[PDB]
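User: I'm writing a short report section on ligand binding and want a predicted complex to refer to. Could you take this sequence and HDD and write out the structure as tokens? A short remark afterwards would be nice.
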Amino acid sequence: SLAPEDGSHRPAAEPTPPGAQPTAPGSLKAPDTRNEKLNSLEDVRKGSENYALTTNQGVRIADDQNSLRAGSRGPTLLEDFILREKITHFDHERIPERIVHARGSAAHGYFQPYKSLSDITKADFLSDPNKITPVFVRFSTVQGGAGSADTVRDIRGFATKFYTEEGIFDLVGNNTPIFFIQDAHKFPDFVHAVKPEPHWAIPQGQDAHDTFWDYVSLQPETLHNVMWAMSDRGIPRSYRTMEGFGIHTFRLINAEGKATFVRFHWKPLAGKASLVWDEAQKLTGRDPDFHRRELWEAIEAGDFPEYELGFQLIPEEDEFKFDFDLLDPTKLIPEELVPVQRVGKMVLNRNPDNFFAENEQAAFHPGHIVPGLDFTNDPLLQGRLFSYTDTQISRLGGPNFHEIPINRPTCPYHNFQRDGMHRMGIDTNPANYEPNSINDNWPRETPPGPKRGGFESYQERVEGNKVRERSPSFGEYYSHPRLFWLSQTPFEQRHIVDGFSFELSKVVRPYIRERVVDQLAHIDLTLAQAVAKNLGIELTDDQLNITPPPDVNGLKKDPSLSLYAIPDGDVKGRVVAILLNDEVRSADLLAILKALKAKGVHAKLLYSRMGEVTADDGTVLPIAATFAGAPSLTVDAVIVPCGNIADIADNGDANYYLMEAYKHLKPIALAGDARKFKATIKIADQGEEGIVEADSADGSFMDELLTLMAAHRVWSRIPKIDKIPA
Amino acid sequence: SLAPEDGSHRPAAEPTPPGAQPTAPGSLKAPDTRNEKLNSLEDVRKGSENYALTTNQGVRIADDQNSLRAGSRGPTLLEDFILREKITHFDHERIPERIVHARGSAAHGYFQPYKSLSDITKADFLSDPNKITPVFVRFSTVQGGAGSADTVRDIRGFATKFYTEEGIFDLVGNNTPIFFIQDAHKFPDFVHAVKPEPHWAIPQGQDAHDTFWDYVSLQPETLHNVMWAMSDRGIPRSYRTMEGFGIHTFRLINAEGKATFVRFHWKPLAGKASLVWDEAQKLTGRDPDFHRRELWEAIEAGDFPEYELGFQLIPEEDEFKFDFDLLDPTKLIPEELVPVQRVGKMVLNRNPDNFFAENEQAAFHPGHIVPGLDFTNDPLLQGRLFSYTDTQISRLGGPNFHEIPINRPTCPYHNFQRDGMHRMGIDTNPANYEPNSINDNWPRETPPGPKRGGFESYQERVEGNKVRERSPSFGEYYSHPRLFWLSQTPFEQRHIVDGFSFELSKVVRPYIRERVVDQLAHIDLTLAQAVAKNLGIELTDDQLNITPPPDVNGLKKDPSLSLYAIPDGDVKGRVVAILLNDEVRSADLLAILKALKAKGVHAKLLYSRMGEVTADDGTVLPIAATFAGAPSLTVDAVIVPCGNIADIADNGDANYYLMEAYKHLKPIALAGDARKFKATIKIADQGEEGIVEADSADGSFMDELLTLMAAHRVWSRIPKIDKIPA
Ligand code: HDD
Ligand code: HDD
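Assistant: Sure. The structure tokens for the complex follow:
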């Protein structure tokens, strides 16, 4: 018995806030959170407590500390089969990572529609507001390996496996509404250009290098998603605070056989929020697991990630009514033209038990659809359909990857397919072919119908010659980038310009930077000029004279394309650093902590060392982390309570904490003599918007602080931060 | 033609300093740098210029921009074999990464001994000072994935493949002279404990988590290598500036059959140097590829990494003469007891062409020895011999991994082994077995002898019963950690305290922190007290009374265990940041660059934007990076030349660049009016050792700066940095 006698090794099996208890496998942390998929995994869940340690063949091991040798200082013997089994399993633990989105974090949850959608689709999982469908969702970055950092600038994946009663449906989306390229034949080129360069394998998790911008400069179709990635969309605060999109136009098919075109959306109920670049980049060093950690801890705290599924629906007869082609995945459908109709809610409420078994081995593929859905001729979607089945043959070791437990349907599956590596199902059917008489032709085909019918493809008319040709309706590259640019606030536009400027500064061949700037001048001259000024490049008179691309269907902006133009803040689940001193005003700390708790905001008590400090009144304050150990990068706001401020006033870490939080536009609140830190951040005596200050933490101090947190960051501080040495 | 007309897309094929040209594949950057192994890869090197783009079956492609479809807006057709080949190859690009040391950076080079070693070994590669052996070297971290960062705190691997005339010898070592564990049976336990925890797969590239410290606390044999990892050895400045060690005692066998015990060492001819923790951690975010990049760029510059191979030799009759067991890999052999004899020099002088083909697929294994070497019964080495052949069957896809080009011997290899996946060699032998008469028994066994003989194991006597038992002589755990502690300078000791304090602050379960401090009390009470104080732990009276462990064979210290106690600085290949302004004094820059060039130190010119600035005399200066884009983390020292200092005096990033460099103990040199930056880092008028200042940058100013850079960091400044907010 090596556990502490007080039982403190084991986290409580109840919701607890971030940092309050060690994290644990979901079935131990939250044994009563169930759904039909979680329950179906019980056949493979393995416990440990009270069991003997064995080999994989069930033989009990007596001494798991030593190899078998001839003499206690002698050579290891070949006959040690316990050693060799254990080292062999170790030696073959790794499987190939995903070719793209190798870095990702996943959770289980459930989805339910708000009302039946039978009028527009026969998909069973959308047929009844009381039908609950379990989900497994993985969120990811794109470029970096499985061991890369989370808060890089990149697109994010947002992949949802719906375990429906009529089959698995995987909605395999990203967090921006378009992709970089038009036709899947170019996917290896694009991916190779953004991935680490092939001679030296640098850089990891960064588009900031020559080959990515070379390809962008040569393929202007890429510019629209490049605009999104260079905005603060590329650096989300959390997977809970980003949008999701299926990108492609798909079809819904109802029981009468009518097709409606659809694009899929996820709206985050926590709101949209992103980091700023300097914070994101520094956070990749201070905590490369920050998004993975934040998702796991939100679920352990009960701050369940919630998202609303929504559809943009366009009738078949309106296919050609826009200035862009609906089948072109580099174009978005502005919500001002086609609104998102709310469909249902997804809540992620339990972590996995074992990351490798459930996250690493999960296989999502957008070809996994169900009756009631269908594809379109989008030429990027069409090639995706080939890739996601083919890649699993190496990644997951063969054609039986649907028998890996996380991938299994919860509905029935029966067919004539047999064998393959790793075959788990032992088929008893006398027949392995159809048509057969020897088993009365079972299992049997099922005609299509309104419910529980076979899959039949929508009978779309095809007419044309066999060509490798891009549709001319796809040959427009700048109007969507411009619509995105004009829809952003002034501070978002600044962050875009700073994104392009920072990334192009890392491109060693200057002509590439020049070619990118020339493309920017086809989108918007103000953008192009601002980036050029940061790169020391002067636009030519020709460039100054490029006419801007047209409006998109009459629109000159669409505010739903901005993260921040329309307030959607939610403070629940956010966190505040509280910088302690060795004699904290206890009345301040009571008021601060209860106000935060009332709004579901978490706190971390920080000091210059671990252990405890004692408040003016004798209250013992346990310390969560030191100032350097939990930097301001990891919090949303900073509060400094009154007390003995001299204890920390000359602490360089405490001062720099406030300087970093101030640079990154975070709300900062200072009570009583903590206002002596105004000099560290150069705040005027009469104060400034974004800094809460008062004689004590009472009255409206915490409400003012919370109001600032609901607006996420103090954008008005931006011109004040250039001078700050931080 | 898409290339620029000026040819500026292609780097010069001559040695160039870091940043001067885009980096390139080895064979294009240094086509005239050759060795027998590099030449032998010519059968598989493939160029590209002037060749048509084809499928892998050699069919020319006309249109590599589009899939084949039925009409230009129609569905993709299954008969598009060009698209499916291209996407199939992409879909199967990844192979499993190495179970441990998945993150590593490699280069080609050559070794030669200083004199023949035939008196102590018959190994051919050590027989003649003028017989050169090609090598391929891979340096690595241990815990993190292939996409993790370089400048983590961790042990580093240092693996050298020697392509000898009598077979491949792989010397598969680390940068510390011992390992964490004694018997290979525990390796999966220890690796699992240090790797990301299994529920949530956090943390990447960090031992700072509960499971690793839980295992440490329960297995005191780990503490010696834990001391090394928590010292600045854990955060080297470059792979050029760390030591290498084979760890285990092996044998040398001479022609007369005499066995000598040997432990292997690499001495870096660039000297020993490490980062400091705050700089290393922030560097993992600002450039997670810093060591990979620095190695590739040093080779491109001609700053070839050089290492001296060294042997500690112990006669067979002296096996039991020390107070530790020579076969225990948690024990080092102090160089005060047994000196390192210099054996030869290895120079790494060409980077690979393709990182995946040559680095990712290289297989090193310490069981690849040659005649003249042999193993010992060290129980960690004994089990390593099983693992490195086993693991390549999944990582490299089967038993023909020696036919992957980088792994091929350059000497002859012929045997009766056949088939296996991706069999390259087509054997013409009518026989695939021996003994055979049908091929007159070829290829034939060869008796052992003085040179070119068959391998025979040294006939060590084995006497003992079949037991799984640890030798009692291995059961001592604190004397080597203590010798290490006592051998460090006071600043190195402070860094060890800080590393333990930082790491244990991240362990959520307090009793684990407590148990590790109790282990530290068994090593040294001053260490244990200093760590306990940072964790808010008070040692008990019993802990204060633990008797220190014995000296190691009478030693109270061995200064060879310190990075810094004996000077061995070499400035060649280091880099300085020069912070420009828009009217630089050309006379300063002349003097600066002259003095740097004389000592082989590179410069990077930084400014507040990219493009160019013009100096006082009209010299146009191209800017390498912005102050934010290439932070002080990435350089060894900072120079600020005179000129229009008002241009940059209030620039936040320029002032922060100096505060960060100052915190991290780097030399800083300020010329003329640049001395106004003294205020930012609170230097008094009379100046401070470590800050060079004069009216202009002259010979004297540069000599002083260069002398500082030879001492690597300004340790005496440590007391002054606690108060700097940076
Ligand atoms: C033709 C190839 C191809 C193209 C054009 C795309 N992808 Fe893809 N995608 C892959 C081929 C691929 C892949 C090779 O099949 C991956 C990696 C391994 C896997 O299981 O699937 C994958 C993984 C993958 C994942 C991670 C799923 C997971 O968590 O395991 C997401 C979220 C996306 N992709 C999303 C997209 C979106 C939104 C695209 C454009 C609209 C896109 N993919 C285009
Ligand atoms: C019994 C298992 C075992 C044990 C006890 C060790 N290793 Fe090991 N090592 C492996 C099993 C392994 C491995 C699983 O076989 C690896 C990874 C995959 C590969 O090709 O080899 C490996 C890789 C590996 C590499 C990377 C080689 C490369 O760059 O590809 C280095 C430098 C070391 N090890 C060094 C050590 C040292 C110095 C050890 C202690 C003295 C040690 N290993 C103990």
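A remark for your report: Chain B touches chain A through 155 residues (CB under 8 Å). The domain at 469-572 of chain B is CATH 1.20.1370.20 (Hemocyanin, N-terminal domain).
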